[PDB]
Amino acid sequence: MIQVYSRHPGKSNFLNCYVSGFHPSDIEVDLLKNGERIEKVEHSDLSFWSFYLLYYTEFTPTEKDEYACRVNHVTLSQPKIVKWDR
Amino acid sequence: MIQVYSRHPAENGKSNFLNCYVSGFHPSDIEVDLLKNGERIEKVEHSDLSFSKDWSFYLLYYTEFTPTEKDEYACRVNHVTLSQPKIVKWD
Numbered sequence A: 001m002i003q004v005y006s007r008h009p010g011k012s013n014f015l016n017c018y019v020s021g022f023h024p025s026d027i028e029v030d031l032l033k034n035g036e037r038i039e040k041v042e043h044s045d046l047s048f049w050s051f052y053l054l055y056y057t058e059f060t061p062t063e064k065d066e067y068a069c070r071v072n073h074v075t076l077s078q079p080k081i082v083k084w085d086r
Numbered sequence B: 001m002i003q004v005y006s007r008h009p010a011e012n013g014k015s016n017f018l019n020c021y022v023s024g025f026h027p028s029d030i031e032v033d034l035l036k037n038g039e040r041i042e043k044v045e046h047s048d049l050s051f052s053k054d055w056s057f058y059l060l061y062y063t064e065f066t067p068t069e070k071d072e073y074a075c076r077v078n079h080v081t082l083s084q085p086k087i088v089k090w091d
Helices: none
Strands: A002-006 A013-020 A027-033 A052-059 A067-083 B002-006 B016-023 B030-036 B045-048 B058-065 B073-089
Touching (some): A013 A067, A027 A052, B002 B073, B016 B030, B030 B058
Antiparallel strands (some): A002 A013, B030 B073, B045 B058
8 A cells, every 4th residue: 555666777877765555645645755754745636446656756765865755644634715806 | 924916017818926935833743725716726836945944934835827807816825743653674
């Protein structure tokens, strides 16, 4: 259900966080470099009745630089509505 | 803190952009829908105009639209709560 791996096998690459089973704004996904959030994370469309998606970011690996993925359930609450006043 | 406005003054049948400006929040703590006749517009864009210097945070959510005489538009800003974290390292 969550798996982390590199797109291609010390130069620029992509780091993938594969999520299978999870309903995506139903979810929040962070990619971490040494425990801290990577700024730009992309994600594929849902692909299917199982599904997966991939959250990925471009990265250059270094031997002591470590990477992870954090997945959280998202709950939406307390809407505030503002009408467009023409 | 939440404002809804068009890029240019609205002229009926003329292409424009609809903006929900949201200030005072980090983007990952809210979820923002733009609405047409009370229903969710599918393709919303967002910019983050923030620095982390403060007030603090300024976010724009927007979409090209053609206003019409009677089509009604709005913005909903939801609170986001995170739970059941899972963390997976890269081996």
